[PDB]
């Protein structure tokens, strides 16, 4: 049925901490993993800053504002936390205009001690850490210079004087662009692309007539203006610029743009905006070389170059993505693919639901999910779809049933098999979070009035129980939990006011007495992913192979632990003509998978899809 006597267990595991300060903004950062360190930066308007630190996963805080000498901190930059468990933090201060250069506070003890240094310049962007080493930092000044440091901020040196974009690469390699005359705004389309693998000792130009560049996966993209027109194309290199090749994508005008929806180690999603202010574009998918692209989804919804898109990578299950499209009648609709872009289809309606006013036929409708685009329209959608790699097949999102995204108050839906089937979880907008690799899910109401109740479920979203965690209702502001969905601590943030006495508060609840017992070998059951028809001999193998998981049973209340790794067992299907895509100068006509040439590189005509692992069968080569 359900667990009982939970109120007593949770009574002793609730801790309240009240922050005494002026209520301005709040910025929360996690330092490292498994350390439990958190930093809170309160900024307000002269201006003042307060800095708080914890070592207890947010249960207790201490005021370390005296370590930064009570200096004001630019919140626009925020905090520059180092990679991995480096325990490095950098804060940029505000200094008088007459000063020659800026000023930073830098630590390497997980914020236990800070050291003050004066830079010889005025930073224009945020410091960037090298992925390979955390002692390397670069930044651009206000005069468009490029300064690098090999000492973690101790000493800086200038390596170029007219840069306008720089980013790190693998093996401490720096790519940047420089403008010869004027400014990168005025000199756009005539830039250069340089590289230096020695941190400023030698340079090698790897591009001319550049318009922009970007890094994704193991590819390097650069947009180059045409010789005699404003149209620009794309070039891709896998050698860090030693050799280039031209991608097989249509050119764009001056008002259009490109966009890397998602890049992988063996694949990239690309968006190409159609001419005019139509508001939609197209999605292309590449091969493992990043050269040949095939049309994937038409009328993809993309607001503008700095706009919003609903594209989402469902990380719970393999090769599943969700996005929004614009229908012929100008109604926003949602699509889902399970083949990694091979095909797209509408979401399946919940088994027991009724279509809303949007639907024309009450016996025919589908689910539609609110996302970042709906948030951009000032609607009652507090969050976006949520999924974790270590929680298998669990997806939570706000949605409404109908023939298009409705403009009424949404509900919350959950899918326990990657997105094949959905069911209604809760009524009305909520804030949700996954704890302990799917062992517990918590929900908080999203209302305009004070709330003093939290709901949790151990059946993986089937039955819920309420717990009253405070006597004085607060105005909820947001939840906080350690990244990775592997902890059992949840922090609730909010403020309570009576008469000008608003004051931040937070509550931290520990579920260690609910999941008392450790999961055994008898609490896990075998599960087959991507299953559609059990009778079929080859059922459930997507992209050439199938996998079986061991998932915790919904009727077991146990703790997975922080050292949980998902069990798995791939099995390989056979190869068919559906596992290959046409290559270069070929196309695939309608109602057949054959590749026929259009009525120096040369191939047979077929190219295996990136990620396929099929063996034997039919090899059209
Ligand atoms: C979508 O998310 C999934 C899950 O995080 C990504 O799969 C991982 O990809 C990394 C490399 O980026 C691999 O090292 C991991 O082994 C993958 N994890 C798995 C399969 O559980 C996937 O790459 C993402 N897709 C895109 C296009 O970025
Ligand atoms: C939830 O927070 C508590 C805060 O006490 C964590 O307990 C600490 O965990 C760290 C892990 O590095 C241990 O070194 C400490 O000794 C623990 N403190 C105490 C007082 O026991 C706890 O680990 C967190 N829970 C989860 C699941 O991560
Ligand atoms: C803090 O700043 C003041 C500014 O007057 C300065 O005199 C003082 O030396 C600083 N303290 C430390 C420990 O650097």
Curated annotation (Swiss-Prot):
Induction of the gene: During osteoblast differentiation.
Record keywords, A-Z: Cell membrane, Cleavage on pair of basic residues, Developmental protein, Differentiation, Disulfide bond, Endocytosis, Endoplasmic reticulum, Endosome, Glycoprotein, Golgi apparatus, Lipoprotein, Lysosome, Membrane, Nucleus, Osteogenesis, Palmitate, Phosphoprotein, Receptor, Repeat, Signal, Transmembrane, Transmembrane helix, Transport
Main location class: Golgi
Post-translational modification: The N-terminal propeptide is cleaved by furin and possibly other homologous proteases. Palmitoylated. Undergoes cysteine S-palmitoylation which promotes the partitioning of the receptor into an endosomal membrane subdomain where it can interact with the retromer cargo-selective complex which mediates its retrograde trafficking to the Golgi apparatus.
Glycosylation sites: 12, 69, 181, 313, 489, 591
GO cellular component: cell surface; cerebellar climbing fiber to Purkinje cell synapse; clathrin-coated pit; clathrin-coated vesicle; cytoplasmic vesicle; cytosol; early endosome; endoplasmic reticulum membrane
Region feature (Interactions with LRPAP1 and NGFB): 519-621
Similarity field: Belongs to the VPS10-related sortilin family. SORT1 subfamily.
One GO process term, biological-process aspect: myotube differentiation
Subcellular location: Golgi apparatus, Golgi stack membrane; Endosome membrane; Endoplasmic reticulum membrane; Nucleus membrane
Coiled-coil annotated residue ranges, if any: none
Topological domain ranges for the Extracellular compartment: 1-621
Tissue-by-tissue expression: Expressed in brain and prostate (at protein level). Expressed at high levels in brain, spinal cord, heart, skeletal muscle, thyroid, placenta and testis. Expressed at lower levels in lymphoid organs, kidney, colon and liver.
Domain notes: The N-terminal propeptide may facilitate precursor transport within the Golgi stack. Intrachain binding of the N-terminal propeptide and the extracellular domain may also inhibit premature ligand binding. The extracellular domain may be shed following protease cleavage in some cell types.
Cystine connections: 164-184, 355-365, 519-558, 541-573, 575-614, 582-595
Protein name: Sortilin
BNR repeats: 52-63, 105-116, 147-158, 194-205, 235-246, 284-295, 335-346, 413-424, 455-466
Connected disease: A common polymorphism located in a non-coding region between CELSR2 and PSRC1 alters a CEBP transcription factor binding site and is responsible for changes in hepatic expression of SORT1. Altered SORT1 expression in liver affects low density lipoprotein cholesterol levels in plasma and is associated with susceptibility to myocardial infarction.
Source organism of the structure: Homo sapiens
GO molecular function, one term: enzyme binding
Taxon lineage: Eukaryota, Metazoa, Chordata, Craniata, Vertebrata
Subunit description: Interacts with LPL and SLC2A4. Interacts with the cytosolic adapter proteins GGA1 and GGA2. Interacts with numerous ligands including the receptor-associated protein LRPAP1/RAP, GM2A and NTS. Forms a complex with NGFR which binds specifically to the precursor forms of NGFB (proNGFB) and BDNF (proBDNF). Interacts with the Trk receptors NTRK1, NTRK2 and NTRK3; may regulate their anterograde axonal transport and signaling. Interacts with CLN5. Interacts with PSAP.
Membrane topology qualifier: Single-pass type I membrane protein
Residues shown, of full length: 87 to 730 of 831
UniProt function note: Functions as a sorting receptor in the Golgi compartment and as a clearance receptor on the cell surface. Required for protein transport from the Golgi apparatus to the lysosomes by a pathway that is independent of the mannose-6-phosphate receptor (M6PR). Lysosomal proteins bind specifically to the receptor in the Golgi apparatus and the resulting receptor-ligand complex is transported to an acidic prelysosomal compartment where the low pH mediates the dissociation of the complex.
């Amino acid at each position: 049925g359900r667990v009982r006597d939970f109120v007593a267990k949770l009574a002793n595991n609730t801790h309240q901490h009240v922050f005494d300060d002026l209520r301005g903004s709040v910025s929360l950062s996690w330092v490292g993993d498994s350390t439990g360190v958190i930093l809170v930066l309160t900024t307000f308007h002269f201006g003042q800053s307060k800095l708080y630190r914890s070592e207890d996963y947010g249960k207790n805080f201490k005021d370390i504002t005296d370590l930064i000498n009570n200096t004001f901190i630019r919140t626009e930059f925020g905090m520059a936390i180092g990679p991995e468990n480096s325990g490095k933090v950098v804060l940029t201060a505000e200094v008088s205009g007459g000063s020659r250069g800026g000023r930073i506070f830098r630590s390497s003890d997980f914020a236990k001690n800070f050291v003050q240094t004066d830079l010889p310049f005025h930073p224009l962007t945020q410091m960037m850490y090298s992925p390979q080493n955390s002692d390397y930092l670069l930044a651009l000044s206000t005069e468009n210079g490029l300064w690098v440091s090999k000492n973690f901020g101790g000493k800086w040196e200038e390596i170029h004087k007219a840069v306008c974009l720089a980013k790190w690469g693998s093996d401490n390699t720096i790519f940047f662009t420089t403008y010869a005359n004027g400014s990168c705004k005025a000199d756009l389309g005539a830039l250069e692309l340089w590289r230096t693998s020695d941190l400023g000792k030698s340079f090698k130009t790897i591009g001319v007539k550049i318009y922009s560049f970007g890094l994704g996966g193991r590819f390097l993209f650069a947009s180059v203006m045409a010789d005699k027109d404003t149209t620009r194309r794309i070039h891709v290199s896998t050698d860090q610029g030693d050799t280039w090749s031209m991608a097989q994508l249509p050119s764009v005008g001056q008002e259009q743009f490109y966009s890397i929806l998602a890049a992988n180690d063996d694949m990239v999603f690309m968006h190409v905006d159609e001419p005019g202010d139509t508001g939609f574009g197209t999605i292309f998918t590449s091969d493992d070389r990043g050269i040949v692209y095939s049309k994937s989804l038409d009328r993809h919804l993309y607001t503008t170059t700095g706009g919003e898109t609903d594209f989402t990578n469902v990380t719970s299950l393999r090769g599943v993505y969700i996005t929004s499209v614009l229908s012929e009648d100008n109604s926003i609709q949602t699509m889902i693919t399970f083949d990694q872009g091979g095909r797209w289809t509408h979401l399946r309606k919940p088994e027991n639901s009724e279509c809303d006013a949007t639907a024309k036929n009450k016996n025919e409708c589908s689910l539609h999910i609110h996302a970042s685009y709906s948030i951009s329209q000032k609607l009652n959608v507090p969050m976006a779809p949520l999924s974790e790699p270590n929680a298998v097949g669990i997806v939570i999102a706000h949605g409404s049933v109908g023939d298009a995204i409705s403009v009424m108050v949404p509900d919350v839906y959950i899918s326990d098999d990657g997105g094949y089937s959905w069911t209604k979880m809760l009524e009305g907008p909520h804030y949700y979070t996954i704890l302990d690799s799917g062992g517990i899910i918590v929900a908080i109401e999203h209302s305009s009035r004070p709330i003093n109740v939290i709901k949790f479920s151990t059946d993986e979203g089937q039955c819920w129980q309420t717990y009253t965690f405070t006597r004085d209702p607060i105005y909820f502001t947001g939840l906080a939990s350690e990244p990775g969905a592997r902890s059992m601590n949840i922090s609730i943030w909010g403020f309570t006011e009576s008469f000008l006495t608003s004051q931040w508060v937070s509550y931290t609840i520990d579920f260690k007495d609910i999941l008392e017992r450790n999961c055994e070998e008898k609490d896990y059951t075998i599960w087959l992913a991507h299953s559609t028809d059990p009778e079929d001999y080859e059922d459930g193998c997507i992209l050439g192979y199938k996998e079986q998981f061991l998932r915790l049973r919904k009727s077991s209340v146990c703790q997975n632990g922080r050292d949980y790794v998902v069990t798995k067992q791939p099995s390989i299907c056979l190869c068919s003509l559906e596992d290959f895509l046409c290559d270069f100068g070929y196309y695939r006509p309608e109602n057949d998978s054959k590749c026929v040439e259009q009525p120096h590189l040369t191939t047979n005509g077929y190219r295996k899809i990136p990620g396929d692992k099929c063996q034997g069968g039919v090899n059209p080569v």
